[PDB]
């Protein structure tokens, strides 16, 4: 278990917009390649993940032998050669969001405020600026929020 | 600017990362905005001059 762009402790405080699962047979002594930046035969011909992965490894039967070329991240190959553990994938609307109990709204104070998974500190009013059905927050002229 | 860091906002890694691991994406944030503060102050004494 190696959670490489977050924690494990803080995967019940944030909201992630979608969440894959990968599924396959690997002997349990080739674990090894399943980490960002690795060779062999599964991290070059089957299986690649990127050098920018967010997102944990868990682990607790044919495969390719040979092939013209490395793959790209997340690429499949069903073509015809071949001889004879879970993959979450992060992507940072919540939609997969986390168990935290909500408490509601207090204006006019500075507060602590987490919108979902954003965190800050300041004084909450009513806003004139009209949106349109297609937002979830807005910025200003030197890109804060 | 990330400066080769994981993200521009230091909430974002205070959030995502445990400290120990937090440490090392903090120092390239520091480091880089020492570098753009020092540059900022030595064209304003030059511009004064």
Not at chain 1, 23 to 44: C, H, L, M, N
Not at chain 2, 33 to 45: D, E
């Given at each position: 278990?190696?959670?490489?762009?977050?924690?494990?402790?803080?995967?019940?405080?944030?909201?992630?917009?979608?969440?894959?699962?990968?599924?396959?047979?690997?002997?349990?002594?080739?674990?090894?390649?399943?980490?960002?930046?690795?060779?062999?035969?599964?991290?070059?011909?089957?299986?690649?993940?990127?050098?920018?992965?967010?997102?944990?490894?868990?682990?607790?039967?044919?495969?390719?032998?040979?092939?013209?070329?490395?793959?790209?991240?997340?690429?499949?190959?069903?073509?015809?050669?071949?001889?004879?553990?879970?993959?979450?994938?992060?992507?940072?609307?919540?939609?997969?969001?986390?168990?935290?109990?909500?408490?509601?709204?207090?204006?006019?104070?500075?507060?602590?405020?987490?919108?979902?998974?954003?965190?800050?500190?300041?004084?909450?009013?009513?806003?004139?600026?009209?949106?349109?059905?297609?937002?979830?927050?807005?910025?200003?002229?030197?890109?804060?929020? | 600017?990330?400066f080769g860091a994981?993200?521009?906002?230091?909430?974002?890694?205070?959030?995502?990362?445990?400290?120990?691991?937090?440490?090392?994406?903090?120092?390239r944030?520091?480091?880089?905005?020492?570098?753009?503060?020092?540059?900022?102050?030595?064209?304003?004494?030059?511009?004064?001059?």
């Amino acid at each position: 278990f190696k959670c490489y762009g977050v924690s494990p402790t803080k995967l019940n405080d944030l909201c992630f917009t979608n969440v894959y699962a990968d599924s396959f047979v690997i002997r349990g002594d080739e674990v090894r390649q399943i980490a960002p930046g690795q060779t062999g035969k599964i991290a070059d011909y089957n299986y690649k993940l990127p050098d920018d992965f967010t997102g944990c490894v868990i682990a607790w039967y044919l495969y390719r032998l040979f092939r013209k070329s490395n793959l790209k991240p997340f690429e499949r190959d069903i073509s015809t050669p071949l001889q004879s553990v879970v993959v979450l994938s992060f992507e940072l609307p919540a939609t997969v969001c986390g168990p935290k109990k909500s408490t509601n709204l207090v204006k006019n104070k500075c507060v602590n405020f987490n919108f979902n998974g954003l965190t800050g500190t300041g004084v909450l009013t009513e806003s004139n600026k009209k949106f349109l059905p297609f937002q979830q927050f807005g910025r200003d002229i030197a890109d804060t929020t | 600017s990330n400066f080769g860091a994981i993200s521009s906002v230091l909430n974002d890694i205070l959030s995502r990362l445990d400290p120990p691991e937090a440490e090392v994406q903090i120092d390239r944030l520091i480091t880089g905005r020492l570098q753009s503060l020092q540059t900022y102050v030595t064209q304003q004494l030059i511009r004064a001059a």
